[PDB]
Each structure stands twice: as C-alpha cells, then as structure tokens.
C-alpha cells in the first residue's frame, strides 16, 4: 500500500511544491527528507533517516522545478525521479502528447519503473496535473495511457485542475480538456476535478489575504493528502484507494469526483464541520446544483473525529443532500477516519462527491468545444503537430457521451 505520485505540468508541479511540503508535515519530516504513521506510502526509505518521496516531477518548461530544486527543496527530491526538457509542451496537447511527449515518455516510464520496482506494495498513482495546459494535460494524457498499459490492475487517481468557467487563462484550453478528459475517462479509475474559480473563492474566505497559486494549492494539497490518509494514518474504517472506485463510481464512466475540505491548531466542534464539509460553496468545482443530484458522496473525517457523531451529523447531512432516485434513504454516503489530523489542524474533513453537477463542467467544456472545433479555431496547432480532427472529434464524442452519462444517472 505504497502510492506512487506523478506531478506533470506546471499546474501539477506547483501542487507538488504544496503537496510534498504538506506530506512532510503530516508525516513529521524536515524539508531535506530526513526524520524530524505509515511513512512507506509516499516516501521511499533510502537510508535510516532520509525519506525520498515517491514522486516523479515530470515537467516541460524546466523553470518550475528550478523554483523547487533551487531554493529550499533540492535535497528532498531525487534527481533520478524527475524530467526537465525544453521546449515546453507549448500549451498545446499535441506538443505534450506527441511532439515533446514522446521524447520524455521513455524517460518517464523508466523512472516510474525504477520507483515501483522499489515497491513492495504498490497500490496507486496520485497523478497531479491540470486538464488545461499542454504539459499537464498533454503529457498527462500520455502518462495515463502508458501507465495503464503498463499497470492495468492498479488504481490511477488523477488530481486534475479544470479550466476556470470565469475566463480562459489559456486560449486553446477547452481543446486541451477534452483531449485529456478522454484519456482520463479511458485509463484513470477515478479523477478529482478541481477548479480554480472555486479554489479562488474558498481560499478568499479562508485567508484574510488575496490568494495565489501557492495558497490555492494548499486546498488541493490537503485534498490530495486526505484522500490517501486513511491509507497511511489508518484509524477506523480503513478506506484504501480501491474503495474510492467501488464505492464512489457507480457506472463505468462516472468517475470525476468533486472534493471539499473542511475546516475552512484549528479545532472544530463537529456538528458544523459536517455542515462545512458538505457546504455547496465548499466543494471545489463549479458544479450544477439547481439541476444536480448526487450519485455517491464520501466523507473522510480525520483527526479528533469520533464515529458516534456521524450517526447524528452525517445522517442529518444526507437528508439535506440530493441523491439520485436509485440511491437508498440513509445510504449512498461512504465514510472513513484517520487517527491523525493534518499539521495545523485538529479535525479535518474531505468529501469526494460523485455528482451529476460535474457534467455541467463537462457541458461547459463541450459548449466551448462546440463552437471552437467546428470553426477550426485553434485546430491547426494540433494538425501541424500530429493530432487530426478525426482524433479530436472522437475525443468529443466520448465526453458528449460522458456529459450524457451523468444525465442518464439522474
């Protein structure tokens, strides 16, 4: 039960600066990698003191890791657990998947394979990226293929960051989602879709300070950790990564999860954390609500959360929630616990929610794809770099199926 991690793209590697500074805090390690709990999950025990993490910092535009391995964290990561190559998967899926992807994918896999042959209980892949760019979404789409083709019986959890519904942040970005959300739907066993519009808002209510993408990622980096902290801080109701596919993914397409965190050393009395965990504004996606009923919610409550309270709290929450008609009365919500909170908090909460609202994220990214693909509106950057319109409309016909697969799941 030792989870490999992949951090592809500038969006993913910037989470890796947030995640491996929170994974070292929750396991109680210093920034160099030595000892200041199941530490075997994230960290490969190289020596008696030093714990090198099981992360590939796979990246094009090698200035992101120059921030990481320049300042304070060069001693932590192993440099045979990385790739840095120019050019930079030029916010272009076909650069990241085909042009500058095939240059690195032999090095990516043989660094993954040199990190999973050191294991001794490999279970998962917390592959962290965005579906927006060209490195996180292009090479992230390529790794998901090659990793499922190499490990077809291991759970591959994709921790994506959706393009914002607010504005673009990249011009060709609705192309890069559907070219990636295809390969997530085909290979990954469950994806957590996160949204920088919700990551702005929830961090805006968190801090008395206007956020930045280091502060946004600490919401993600807890969600990346809280999913896999019933796997390493065991407690009661041990929820491994195999139970986020059997419990939360009803149909073979509906595996795009909307995760919240609460509280947003911070203590919380916990009849209100469950009201904070399943707040509609605390879910980290712009999912639909007035035309949205859930499929399967989760609740990983970590720290000083005793299980008697959820018979009164969570049964009250699930009455307040909206599930599909084919989910039972008090059922439909799995639970879990950890015996150790994150450092800085005293009782946390997570909620992977599989919901029809995430199809509104899909319907946005198809309605943007609908105008933009038929008018060839950035298509020649894919065509002149390997990927034709046949390969791109076929990416739409799965996501248009997937946006229908939640509307079939109501």
């Amino acid at each position: 039960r030792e989870i490999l991690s992949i951090h592809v793209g500038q969006c993913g590697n910037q989470i890796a600066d947030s995640f491996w500074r929170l994974a070292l805090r929750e396991h109680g390690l210093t920034e160099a990698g030595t000892l200041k709990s199941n530490m075997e999950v994230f960290f490969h025990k190289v020596r008696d003191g030093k714990y090198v993490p099981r992360a590939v910092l796979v990246d094009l535009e090698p200035g992101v890791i120059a921030r990481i391995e320049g300042g304070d964290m060069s001693q932590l990561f192993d440099e045979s657990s990385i790739v840095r190559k120019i050019p930079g998967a030029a916010n272009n899926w076909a650069r990241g998947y085909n042009v500058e992807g095939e240059k690195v994918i032999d090095q990516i896999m043989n660094v993954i394979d040199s990190a999973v042959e050191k294991t001794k209980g490999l279970q998962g892949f917390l592959m962290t990226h965005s579906i927006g760019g060209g490195s996180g979404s292009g090479l992230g789409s390529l790794i998901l293929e090659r990793l499922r083709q190499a490990y077809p019986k291991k759970r591959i959890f994709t921790f994506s960051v959706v393009p914002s519904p607010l504005i673009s942040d990249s011009a060709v970005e609705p192309y890069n989602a559907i070219l990636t959300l295809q390969r997530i739907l085909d290979n990954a066993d469950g994806a957590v879709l996160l949204d920088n519009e919700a990551l702005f808002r929830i961090a805006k209510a968190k801090l008395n300070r206007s956020p930045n993408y280091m502060d946004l990622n600490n919401i993600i980096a807890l969600i990346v950790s809280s999913v896999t902290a019933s796997l390493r801080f065991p407690g009661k109701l041990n929820t491994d990564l195999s139970e986020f596919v059997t419990n939360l993914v009803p149909f073979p397409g509906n595996h795009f999860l909307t995760a919240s965190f609460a509280p947003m050393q911070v203590r919380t009395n916990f009849p209100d954390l469950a009201r904070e965990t399943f707040a509609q504004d605390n879910f980290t996606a712009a999912i639909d609500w007035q035309q949205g009923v859930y499929l399967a919610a989760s609740a990983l409550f970590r720290g000083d959360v005793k299980a008697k309270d959820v018979d009164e709290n969570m049964a009250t929450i699930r009455k307040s929630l909206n599930y599909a008609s084919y989910m039972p009365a008090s059922g439909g919500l799995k639970l879990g616990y950890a015996e150790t909170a994150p450092e800085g908090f005293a009782s946390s909460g997570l909620a992977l929610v599989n919901h029809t609202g995430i199809a509104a994220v899909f319907e946005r990214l198809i309605a943007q794809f609908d105008i933009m693909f038929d008018n060839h509106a950035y298509t020649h950057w894919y065509e002149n770099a390997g990927v034709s319109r046949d390969m791109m409309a076929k990416a739409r016909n799965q996501i248009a199926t997937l946006a229908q697969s939640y509307r079939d799941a109501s």
Partner: protein
C-alpha cells in the same frame, strides 16, 4: 531554458534593438555598455534565454543572442559606439550602400549579398543555443532594409529550420504621414513574408506610439528614443515570460504564446498594448491598480496601432501581467468584465492567455502587456492595400522595383497575397460577428 534570438533588421529594427538590449541587460542586472555583469554575482532572472556565457570567469561579458543586420553602416556604428563590448561584433553586420526604400535591394540585392553572412551567424547562435524556441525579428514594414531583408531573412529561416517560431516584431507605416515615399509598396511586399513565412508579426505604428508618449508620457515631442522605449517596454514585456523563472511565473514560450494567439495560419498579425503608461516622473500616489490598468489597456488610444481596437473584434487576446501582484482573484475578474465589454469573436468562446511574471519591470512595478490579435489589423492593412492601389493604377515610381529583378506579374501576386491577408480578417470578422 528556451533560448530566443533577436534579429534586428533595418534602421527601425536596430534602433528598437539598440534600446531593447539596453533594457533587457538592465533588466537582468547587466551593464548595457560592457556586457559584463556586476563582479562576482550572478545576473538576476534567467539570463540564458537571450544571452550567452562568454568567458567562464563569472564576471565576463554576456553576449546577447542578437544579430543586427542593416545595409547602411551608420546605424550599427551608432550601436557599436553605444554598446561597447556587449554584442558579438561578428553579429553586428553592416554594409556600405544601403537600400533606401527599395524592397528589391534588401530582398533581392544588397540583402541577398549579406544572406550567406547573416545565416552563417544565425547558425552560430542556434548551435550555441540549448534548444532555441523562437526568433524575434525586429524590423519595420516600411523601408527597403527592414521590410526588404526582413522579408528575405524570415523566408530564409523558416525555409531552413521551420520548427521554430518567428515573431516579427515589426513597425507598420504610420498613416498620418509616410516616412518613405515607397512605403505602401514595401509593406505589401513584406506582407507576402509576414503572412506566409512568419508565425506571427507583432505590429507597431508610429502614429499611436506618438500619442502614447505625448498624451500618456506627457512630453511635448516624442522622439524615436521614446518610440523605441514604448515598443521596447512591450518587447521586454512579452519576453518576460521567456526570461524569468520566478515564484509563479507562467513561463510562456513563443510557441506557447502563438498557439494561444494564432487561430488559423493567416490570422497572426498581433497588436500590442502596455499598462501603465504612467510617465517616469514618479507618480507614486497615481500608480494604477490591476482593476484600472485593464481599463487603460483596452482604450482605443491605448494600443500600439493606428486602428481603433474596440471598434472591431478582438479575436485572440493575451494579457501578460508582469510584476508584483497582490491580487490573483481581482486579476482575471477585471478581464471578466472585459469579456463583456470588449468585442470578442464567437468563433472563439474565450481567449485570454494570462501570463504572470513576478519579476517586475524596470520602469514599472506593476506592469501589464497586452497582445490582442485583432480583426482591426486588416483595417491598418486596408489603408496599405488602398495606398498600394493608388500607386499601382499609375504604376508608380518607376523601374526601381522592376530593374532589380522583380516582375509586374510578381507584384500583382503580392498585392493579391496582401488582399488574401486583408480578406482573411474580413472572413474572420463577419463570421466572428
């Protein structure tokens, strides 16, 4: 890091690049008159995007990846007097005769003579690069050298390499008065190249660059020392994502910039704008926030172009913030109002490629740069297409183009190839309406 060559053709391109490498060297903490940095200490930012390590003593000169090409000697000899040992003087190529508003001297003539020597120095730069991912050719689209050899060089470089972006940061003819008598000729002869064999042609216009230094930088007579600083601060703004690896710097390569800004292969003429246009007199309590710089980005008299930008359709937009930002959600939400205010083109649902660079500008602390691929940029070239036709119904000047090797059949092709350019936004305006 992604290396990038700044080729400087013509007098108008060199005098930008005279001031461009003044800026970029000062931006990296390098002396712009010696090429050497401060003694012992590394240059700030990522120097190797534009520069090269000359001498491994850590105090020696850093030669910029820049070839300065002009057929007149007086322009680069002005640069050699005002750069010292900064440039590589094997790259500072000059000739004697000049071109003089004749496209067919820079293209097929004295520029043909320098082309085995110019390309033998791009090959020197590119082989010296780690992996070069853009070539920023600075010229004008008005003269005989910058529009002549710039049309030659770019067609001699994508023909040779082809897997590299050519951002022709170029200066259009001002419509208020023509600085060359054959200036609506020489544009259309370069609009063959800058449409076909350049991946993007970043325009600038000397009328708008006068107004943005007179009304905005509050001086009486804006000289070409200050036209080549409005352009420079924009060219040192679009290349701050290329040169800086900072806190949360969105590292935008040229290809990474042009995939967001060239929608289909005939729509890559990009305008530009800069914010704040606060004068350098330290207007500290009048320094503009991010909610109001974007209000000053998109004024009609705020782009570096003769056209009126909000009177036509912004097809692809790339707002490159550069500097100290406190407000990320106040960022991009001002653009959310600007998604509603500005004429966009469905034909594209959304297009705002947003760069952040934490390394601030020299003149400004919170600086913003725009790159709007506008449909109005055919309306600049509608003037040039019309001023060509008034000088072709008469069959203007003389034999001057025709005696050098060009033909009347060829000139009518390049007018059509500029007509194919102007209609290519007219295709994209009403279909984008």
């Amino acid at each position: 890091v992604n290396n990038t060559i700044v080729v400087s053709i013509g007098q108008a391109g060199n005098q930008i690049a005279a001031s461009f490498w003044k800026t970029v060297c000062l931006e990296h903490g390098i002396d712009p008159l010696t090429g050497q940095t401060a003694p012992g200490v590394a240059p700030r930012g990522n120097w190797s995007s534009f520069f090269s390590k000359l001498g491994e003593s850590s105090s020696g000169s850093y030669v910029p990846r820049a070839i300065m090409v002009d057929l007149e000697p007086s322009v680069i000899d002005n640069v050699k007097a005002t750069s010292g040992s900064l440039f590589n003087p094997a790259n500072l190529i000059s000739r004697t005769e000049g071109a003089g508003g004749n496209f067919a001297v820079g293209y097929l003539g004295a520029g043909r003579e320098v082309l085995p020597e110019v390309m033998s120095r791009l090959d020197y730069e590119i082989d010296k690069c780690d992996n070069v991912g853009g070539i920023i050719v600075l010229h004008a689209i008005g003269g005989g050298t910058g529009s002549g050899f710039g049309a030659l060089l770019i067609e001699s470089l994508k023909e040779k390499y082809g897997e590299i972006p050519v951002l022709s940061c170029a200066v259009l003819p001002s419509p208020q008065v023509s600085s060359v008598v054959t200036e609506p000729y020489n544009t259309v002869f370069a609009l063959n190249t800058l449409r076909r064999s350049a991946d993007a042609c970043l325009i600038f216009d000397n009328e708008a660059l006068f107004d943005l230094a007179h009304r905005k930088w509050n001086i009486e007579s804006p000289t070409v020392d200050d036209l080549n600083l409005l352009i420079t601060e924009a060219l040192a703004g679009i290349t701050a994502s290329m040169r800086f690896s900072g806190f949360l710097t969105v590292e935008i390569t040229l290809r990474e910039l042009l995939t967001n800004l060239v929608p289909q292969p005939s729509l890559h003429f990009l305008m530009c704008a800069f914010a704040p246009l606060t004068p350098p007199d330290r207007s500290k309590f009048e320094e503009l926030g991010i909610e109001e710089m974007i209000k000053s980005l998109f004024d009609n008299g705020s782009v570096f172009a003769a056209c009126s930008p909000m009177e036509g359709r912004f097809l692809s937009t790339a707002v490159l913030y550069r500097g100290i930002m406190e407000d990320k959600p106040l960022a991009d939400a001002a653009l959310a109002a600007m998604r509603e205010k500005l004429p966009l083109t469905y034909w594209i649902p959304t297009a705002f490629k947003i760069g952040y660079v934490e390394q601030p500008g020299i003149s400004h602390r919170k600086s913003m740069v725009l790159l709007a691929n506008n449909t109005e940029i055919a309306r600049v070239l509608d003037r040039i297409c019309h001023n060509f036709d008034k000088l072709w119904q008469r069959k203007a000047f003389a034999n001057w183009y025709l005696n050098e090797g060009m033909s009347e059949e060829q000139i009518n092709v390049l007018r059509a190839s500029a007509q194919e350019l102007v209609q290519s936004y007219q295709v994209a305006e009403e279909s984008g309406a």
